[PDB]
Write a protein that binds this ligand. Sequence first.
Ligand code: NAD
Ligand code: NAD
Ligand code: NAD
Ligand code: NAD
Lengths: 314, 313, 313, 314
Amino acid sequence: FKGNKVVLIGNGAVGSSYAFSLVNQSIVDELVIIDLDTEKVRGDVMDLKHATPYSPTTVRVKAGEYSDCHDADLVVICAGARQKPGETRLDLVSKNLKIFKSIVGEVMASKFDGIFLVATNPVDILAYATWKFSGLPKERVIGSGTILDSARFRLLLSEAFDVAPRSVDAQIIGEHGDTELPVWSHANIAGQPLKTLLEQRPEGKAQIEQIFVQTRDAAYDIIQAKGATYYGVAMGLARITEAIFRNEDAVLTVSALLEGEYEEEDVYIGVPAVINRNGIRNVVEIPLNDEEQSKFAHSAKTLKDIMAEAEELK
Amino acid sequence: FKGNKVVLIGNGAVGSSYAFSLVNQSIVDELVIIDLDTEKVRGDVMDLKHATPYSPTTVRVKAGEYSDCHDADLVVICAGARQKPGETRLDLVSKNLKIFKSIVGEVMASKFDGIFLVATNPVDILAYATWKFSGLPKERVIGSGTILDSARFRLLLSEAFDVAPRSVDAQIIGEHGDTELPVWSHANIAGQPLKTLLEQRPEGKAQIEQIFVQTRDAAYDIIQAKGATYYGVAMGLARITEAIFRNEDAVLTVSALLEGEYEEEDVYIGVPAVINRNGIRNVVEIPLNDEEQSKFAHSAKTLKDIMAEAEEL
Amino acid sequence: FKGNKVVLIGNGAVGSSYAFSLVNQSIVDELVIIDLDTEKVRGDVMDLKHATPYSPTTVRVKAGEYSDCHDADLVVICAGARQKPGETRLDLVSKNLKIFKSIVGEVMASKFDGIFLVATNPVDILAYATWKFSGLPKERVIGSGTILDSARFRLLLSEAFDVAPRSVDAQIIGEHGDTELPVWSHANIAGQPLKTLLEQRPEGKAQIEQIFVQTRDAAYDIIQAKGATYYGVAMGLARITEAIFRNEDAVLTVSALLEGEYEEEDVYIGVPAVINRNGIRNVVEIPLNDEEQSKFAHSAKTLKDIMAEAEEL
Amino acid sequence: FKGNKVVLIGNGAVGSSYAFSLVNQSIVDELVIIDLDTEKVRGDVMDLKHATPYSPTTVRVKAGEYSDCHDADLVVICAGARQKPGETRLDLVSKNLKIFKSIVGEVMASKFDGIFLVATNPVDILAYATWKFSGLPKERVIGSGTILDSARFRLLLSEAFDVAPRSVDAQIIGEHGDTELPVWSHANIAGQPLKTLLEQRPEGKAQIEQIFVQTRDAAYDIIQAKGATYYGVAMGLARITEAIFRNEDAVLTVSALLEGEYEEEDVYIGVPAVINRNGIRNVVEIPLNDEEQSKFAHSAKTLKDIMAEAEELK
Ligand SMILES: NC(=O)c1ccc[n+]([C@@H]2O[C@H](COP(=O)([O-])OP(=O)(O)OC[C@H]3O[C@@H](n4cnc5c(N)ncnc54)[C@H](O)[C@@H]3O)[C@@H](O)[C@H]2O)c1
Ligand SMILES: NC(=O)c1ccc[n+]([C@@H]2O[C@H](COP(=O)([O-])OP(=O)(O)OC[C@H]3O[C@@H](n4cnc5c(N)ncnc54)[C@H](O)[C@@H]3O)[C@@H](O)[C@H]2O)c1
Ligand SMILES: NC(=O)c1ccc[n+]([C@@H]2O[C@H](COP(=O)([O-])OP(=O)(O)OC[C@H]3O[C@@H](n4cnc5c(N)ncnc54)[C@H](O)[C@@H]3O)[C@@H](O)[C@H]2O)c1
Ligand SMILES: NC(=O)c1ccc[n+]([C@@H]2O[C@H](COP(=O)([O-])OP(=O)(O)OC[C@H]3O[C@@H](n4cnc5c(N)ncnc54)[C@H](O)[C@@H]3O)[C@@H](O)[C@H]2O)c1
């Protein structure tokens, strides 16, 4: 009768923010933190512990090492190099594949047999790498993917239509990055067709474009202003973690392995997927219009081309 | 029919962590953020907004200016200088009093008439300054005080006795800082007398001392390790914010103005107090044993002596 | 600096279940309960209070009278006759209109100036009566309407497609009752077209019909089995109450007054509407396909024809 | 990677109220309901399901049968006869021991191997019976016990001292019934000694007595007014369920087997106990003053005497 145990690997801006989300939300009762930078781990574990007395239910936070993964239920990896102003996520594949080779190896050696959730960029390729490196079933390796892009798209739409974000059903799919695409054929508020409504406005075409551009380029805009992003992804990671430990069968856009869905194979990419205690139950295959079909195929190809050139993946 | 509006002033490590706590907890539906550093604000407001679609209920985050305080319900101040390794919180007094004279003046000029909640150090003196600069009733000016020290004490006890932190009722009172004191006459788990039980262990006196030393010196230990603290205080600030907006009448240890309670006057200091939508309803006066009476009076005197020498005050 | 106060009028199966939902959810900090049956109220208020120490945040429950409505923020009406096996909700109109003339008059005489939320059946007509008897603006009078039908529709779809209910976006609009209609032009899971997918299955047309029939007739099925329904409606009432007190601007299907939207006027009927601290901010006008336009107009006419014949109205 | 599954046996006022709490609180993702009265089960399951779309996270509700207990994590028993005005809880032992013999037998036959939580009265004796009938470790059989009495005591004190119930730490221990006792040596608000404070008031001794009398006799007062109690116990049951599935190590007053604690053995009785995913981790042994020692011993003896006369327990 064990409790729920999360091991976080990588305790920088993103990891520590995710840790604080877990302390606020009490999704799990035990969190173990691993990082090369043991002193920052020490400092954050103490600071975090001091918040736990106000957590809705008990959360135990501790500094850990790889042996601690043996009975972990979820391993969350936020370790690695981040982009500078003027850099793309794909600009990181080389260094971060190096790092994941090491990390996932250390984890599997502890006899870990849970679920992986990865945030390190480029997240689709790193999720793919975690799947390949680990040998685990696809259901048990998840990338955060467009969990965050979808939230940004919803946030910008909630402002444009002046309603709660919870009342906007809208999705970004594809690469978590420059080839991502909005699913305008779906995006709605209680059935209001948002793109059609925007098009009716003056320079509506312009507004439709700005909403997508601000979605696609949000990471760049935040990095320009404060150097790094972390709250959005931390919250997105928390949301996925919740769907797993509360066994929800909730549909979320995450980075998932495709094996024939959307006519693509052998690539992790952002799609709606059913999430439960077992990880990804299945990819959800939605109708795409012609523009969406064309953009999704191009995104998959973009990712697959970069993967074919990554020597670490061979 | 207005919603609940918080203005954060000071969006650094502490302020932004508090803002993220509010995005996670959905205590209020509107958060406005002010800092001299407008670029950091723009960046944080964006990053935070992107978390809000997953908030339990709607939270709107925006960059603001003082004029936005006119109809604010709570102003939370986390602006100012922090301490370096080696420094105490009292070392910050002159610098942060000058800053508060400016901030509080700009807030009051907006016609603000809500509640203030202060974290800037030294927090007891700065809560007092906020009360005096603002002219507001004492019920409406709160310092975070020992909200955080009490949590640390509970956390260390919960490890020493191996139970949930929410099952430990234990309190730190006094200055948020070096003259703070544990209330061992009270500390208990379902009535287990924690000091008495600890004294029964091998080198129990030593354990009793180490638990308080690790509580008292936690800030220094964290700063040594990662340069500043922010999660504990953000969570404590969120707890107080919840007691207010959910009108709880919850008893929390915060920095409050004393006017006779504990035989002290004209000083903000950490004590249990009842918190509700109107702010501090009243200070709770608990019995202290002789050691605790001694230390509490010493803590009050220490703060009052510092206030007596402060040019701004 | 007032807290949030709800007065429940009608403490039967529905009212007491709603009260228990509020004790579980801590949406508001104060709940006052009125019923002619003062013994049941005394008994429920006690039982409920005993649950409150485990509520997420403070909830105070008490027995009240109309005078207690003076500073209430929300009055929720669940008082009146329910239907028997075999009866429709429209059968209740004359009896429950007489009751509302009395209740609403007693509330308004207390100087109440908040929001009304109505569950008594037939709920659309009784929300309309509440608006007219009270003289309050339409934003401040809400019927629960299809909040519950939409939930049932989502629940049955979530079983048909094997995903979380919160992952199904689907709506019932129109009368809360026999002329209600599914919005199949919208119903989707992450964009999966649910009617189209169902039509692809063996006897898909049949499944499509059975899903709506089980939605439309759910109340009758539950009443046949246990004599009355209460959990679904209590939960829906709590959802609406949350959207108000957390100022959400959330879109929910409730009974709202139409003044031109959907080409209908002078009728309360179930439609998506934006809900916040001020009540219904506005009705949301969504595109309906030809079948849905037909059925919605028929539902509106059905309600308006009944209102036209009602002596009290 | 299974989710969390609760089977409720007995779907009357108490059981159905507990079920509605679980739908509001989303403690677990799956609830199965068993009752002889299959029609009321059918009606409640439907009514409850229709609430689940607004649950914080997914809750699946269904009508079940004993075979469904095979992989249940928690079985909650609220089945059986309830008291009439003018009756005590011990007035039920005979009929309800009969019923538990049957129920627990049917459950164990399904190969259930989780935790039992019992509410049926008299709850201490019925928890003891569930332990004996089932053969399960004491850690895995819990009675609701004074979870409710403690809440009532706290509620009455919160009114007398005008603070949040969450800020009153106070406990009732002993039999869930007439021999229960307040722990005045402990009861406090942030260290304020409540009994001492009450004694300082005019007729303070009277008020101290009324507070206890209204605690002890609450069930009778509610039964006189509306015929049965159910919300308080449902909420108390929910609280215990939460401590289990969120693995809290929270101290709650519940009915637990004593094996030497408080100098008593072979009796289930209301005491503070540490609750986690494994059930009762341990009884918490607090100092009692002389009056409390005397009353607790008498309560244990009262229960043990009645057990020795219950032929069903032999
Ligand atoms: N998926 C998303 O939506 C998203 C959003 C923002 C950032 N990111 C990515 O997440 C990653 C982390 O970003 P950040 O801002 O937290 O960076 P950071 O520099 O703040 O933290 C990186 C952490 O990784 C640790 N680390 C490096 N190698 C390690 C190893 N081999 N083993 C254990 N720990 C190791 C470092 O010590 C450091 O603590 C970056 O790749 C960034 O691109 C993803
Ligand atoms: N009460 C506690 O438990 C506790 C805990 C930790 C820190 N603190 C105190 O909190 C304060 C903030 O700490 P931090 O780590 O966030 O510091 P930080 O350096 O990260 O941030 C300080 C922020 O204050 C802003 N600021 C300075 N003057 C301003 C002004 N006049 N108007 C608007 N903004 C102004 C700065 O621009 C900066 O954004 C420090 O005094 C620290 O000692 C208190
Ligand atoms: N909107 C929906 O989805 C929905 C669902 C279920 C029931 N309902 C309706 O809710 C209403 C209540 O149903 P119920 O099962 O709780 O009925 P019930 O018989 O259990 O309770 C009705 C309560 O109304 C009280 N009452 C009658 N007149 C009163 C008055 N003048 N002043 C104060 N109290 C008065 C009665 O004393 C009783 O306590 C019925 O009209 C039912 O049709 C609506
Ligand atoms: N522990 C507490 O704090 C507390 C509080 C209130 C009530 N109770 C007790 O809880 C029990 C239930 O009370 P209630 O008000 O819900 O009673 P109720 O009559 O409303 O419900 C009893 C249910 O048990 C079912 N049942 C009877 N025998 C069964 C069997 N053999 N198998 C499966 N189901 C069976 C009945 O069909 C009925 O649905 C009573 O013993 C009451 O004394 C305990």
